[PDB]
Amino acid sequence: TAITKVEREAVLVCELPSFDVTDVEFDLFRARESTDKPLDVAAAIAYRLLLGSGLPQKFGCSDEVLLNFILQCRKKYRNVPYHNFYHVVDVCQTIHTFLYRGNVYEKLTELECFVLLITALVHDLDHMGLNNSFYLKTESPLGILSSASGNTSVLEVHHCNLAVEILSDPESDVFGGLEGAERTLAFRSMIDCVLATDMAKHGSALEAFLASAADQSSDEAAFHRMTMEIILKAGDISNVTKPFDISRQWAMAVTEEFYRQGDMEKERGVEVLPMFDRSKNMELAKGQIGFIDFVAAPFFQKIVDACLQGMQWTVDRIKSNRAQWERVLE
Numbered sequence: 006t007a008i009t010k011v012e013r014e015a016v017l018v019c020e021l022p023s024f025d026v027t028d029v030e031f032d033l034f035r036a037r038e039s040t041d042k043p044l045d046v047a048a049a050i051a052y053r054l055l056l057g058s059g060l061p062q063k064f065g066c067s068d069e070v071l072l073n074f075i076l077q078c079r080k081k082y083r084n085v086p087y088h089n090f091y092h093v094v095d096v097c098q099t100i101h102t103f104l105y106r107g108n109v110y111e112k113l114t115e116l117e118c119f120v121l122l123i124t125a126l127v128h129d130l131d132h133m134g135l136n137n138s139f140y141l142k143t144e145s146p147l148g149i150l151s152s153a154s155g156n157t158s159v160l161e162v163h164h165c166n167l168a169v170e171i172l173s174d175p176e177s178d179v180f181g182g183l184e185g186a187e188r189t190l191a192f193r194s195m196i197d198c199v200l201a202t203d204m205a206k207h208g209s210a211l212e213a214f215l216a217s218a219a220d221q222s223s224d225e226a227a228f229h230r231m232t233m234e235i236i237l238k239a240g241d242i243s244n245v246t247k248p249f250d251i252s253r254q255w256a257m258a259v260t261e262e263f264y265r266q267g268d269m270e271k272e273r274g275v276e277v278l279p280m281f282d283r284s285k286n287m288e289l290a291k292g293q294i295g296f297i298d299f300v301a302a303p304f305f306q307k308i309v310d311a312c313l314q315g316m317q318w319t320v321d322r323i324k325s326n327r328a329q330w331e332r333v334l335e
């Protein structure tokens with residue numbers, strides 16, 4: 006279904022006064038509250054980020070095709086508490102800061118940077134607020150296909166299907182100005198990156214990045230592809246790297262989405278992990294401190310020390326946020 010001029014214009018009128026979408030302290034929550042059309046403000050933010058990068062122009066992507074693409078993506082996000090359009094616009098904004106404030110763009114081609122910013126916006130398409138384990142536990146029809154065809158990444162394959170669908174329309178094909186090996190690389194790297202966001206692949210992903218970083222000269226292509234995967238993963242788990250009040254609001258949203266999954270599991274009589282169990286009754290800080298200690302702090306420290314020195318602020322902020330969660334526990 007084609008994007009209309011009227012849908013484009015409602016995005017184009019958002020001027021985002023008092024916001025700098027390129028800054029590491031940018032507050033998407035404040036942006037959403039700033040008007041009564043937060044879906045338009047979010048789309049404008051994505052649009053300004055992509056155009057501001059100078060990348061779509063270089064790869065033959067018109068302003069209009071870019072905006073159509075952003076709006077086709079937006080239509081395929083659901084009204085779930087966390088994995089909605091605001092999460093992927095956030096991931097897009099965050100990756101922009103890693104590339105340009107954290108100087109990770111130096112490690113990548115311009116095309117790879119363009120693909121990363123585009124891929125941020127597709128990477129969770131039509132998320133329903135249930136994780137891969139739910140579909141597997143319940144033998145949902147919606148994930149029988151995945152296991153039957155040799156992959157457990159039910160959601161991520163689904164996101165890729167839909168990204169390909171959006172891009173198949175010339176009106177929203179942001180890769181339509183590419184040809185040959187470049188067009189092929191855009192699609193392949195986009196899909197590799199989305200598939201790599203499955204946290205069941207987190208450990209192997211991180212360890213494959215660290216290996217290629219320790220020896221970049223031996224296989225440049227591999228290092229480029231792994232750097233893209235790790236930066237999309239970094240954007241995806243970046244909530245704990247933000248100013249505390251922003252970080253706390255993301256944590257509230259993730260937790261509500263998890264609890265809704267847990268409630269559906271109780272309805273089905275299947276297993277509910279404590280992290281998903283509304284009845285255990287919080288507290289927010291305990292879950293955050295745990296996620297920081299066991300997942301997020303070691304991830305950012307390892308990728309920063311290995312390679313990505315310009316992203317040191319992520320480690321600093323994680324440390325800071327952890328201390329604040331400790332104070333909230335009294």
Ligand SMILES: COc1ccc(C(=O)Nc2c(Cl)cncc2Cl)cc1OC1CCCC1
Pocket residue numbers: 202203204241242244245252255256257259260280292293295296
């Ligand atoms: C804002 O705090 C969190 C942010 C993100 C995630 C998280 O697991 N995100 C994620 C998910 Cl849920 C699925 N695939 C990839 C990723 Cl990165 C998890 C977070 O904390 C959870 C909630 C209680 C402990 C873990």
Ligand SMILES: [Mg+2]
Pocket residue numbers: 128129160202203
């Ligand atoms: Mg995902």
Ligand SMILES: [Zn+2]
Pocket residue numbers: 092096128129241
């Ligand atoms: Zn995501």
